[PDB]
Every structure is written in C-alpha cells, then in structure tokens.
Amino acid sequence: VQLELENLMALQNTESALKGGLNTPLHES
Amino acid sequence: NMILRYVKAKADWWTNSAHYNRERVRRGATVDKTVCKKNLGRLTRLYLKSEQERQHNYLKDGPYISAEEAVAIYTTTVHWLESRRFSPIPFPPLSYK
C-alpha cells in the first residue's frame, strides 16, 4: 500500500495548478 | 404482506392529506397554527424521505456529470483565472495582520 500512499500524496497535498510549478511525478499503480 | 398493504394505505392517506392541507395553507383557507405546524412536520418528513432517495441514488447512479463535462468546466476556470492573474488565497498566516 505504501506505493499508492506515496502516489496519492502527490495528488492531494500539492499547491494549486494556478501557481504552475512542475508536476509531482506519480507512480504507475 | 397484509401489514405492508395497510402501511401503504396509511401512508397514502398521510401524504395525500399533507398535500391537501398545504393547498389550504397556500390559498389561505386555514388560519389554525396547529394545522400549519402539523403539516410542516409531515412535509419535512416527505422531503427527507425523498432526499434520502436522492443521496442514495447518487452513489448508485454515480456522478451525474460526465468526466468530459467536469474537465471542460475545470479547464475553463483555469483559462479564466490564469488570464485574470488570480493569485490563489493562502492559508491564514500564523501572525496575519
């Protein structure tokens, strides 16, 4: 489950898209 | 099965009298506060009885908005707020003035 925990923390706790910045990378689940 | 029939007869009478009394309260053919306060109770239940249906059906029927529409409106606000240079609202700082 730790793989998907790390995956969704890149989806949840990012700053907003309107700020720009590089995307967090994700993993294939 | 016998019980269920009588519960539906009591039910139908109970809701049908809620409708009739509310038309009286709308038209003004009743000036008794207890009838109005009674009828509001019935209608509050009849609302929730249908709202519980609506909330259950949502999880059963899924998102009524398509993923197409949802990304359409999402991208539309990004293109708007980008062109407006909207700086997003920060979390209240620890020592905000």
Binding site: - | G28, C36, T44, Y47, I89
Partner: protein, 48 residues
C-alpha cells in the same frame, strides 16, 4: 488548527421555515464549528 487537522464533523440538524407559499431549509451547525466557518467566511470574502 481545525482547517489543517479535521475533516469529520458533528451531525447537522435540519429544520424548515414555514413561508406559506414555500418551505426554506434551515440548518444548525454545531456552535464550536460555526465560529470556525464564520471566520473562514469572513476571511474568504475579504481575500477574494
């Protein structure tokens, strides 16, 4: 601390307000939560 660290809230009571042509739904939020929503409501509208 609430906005950072909680996402499960006490149940909201509901009531209706009896304008004779149409009922308006009325909700009572728990008092400890209203003070947080009310600050946030004030904060959101000022910043926006």
């Amino acid at each position: 601390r609430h906005m950072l660290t909680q996402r499960a809230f006490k149940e909201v009571g509901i009531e209706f307000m009896d304008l004779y042509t149409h009922l308006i739904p009325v909700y009572d939020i728990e008092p400890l939560e209203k003070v947080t929503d009310a600050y946030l409501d004030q904060y959101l509208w000022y910043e926006a």
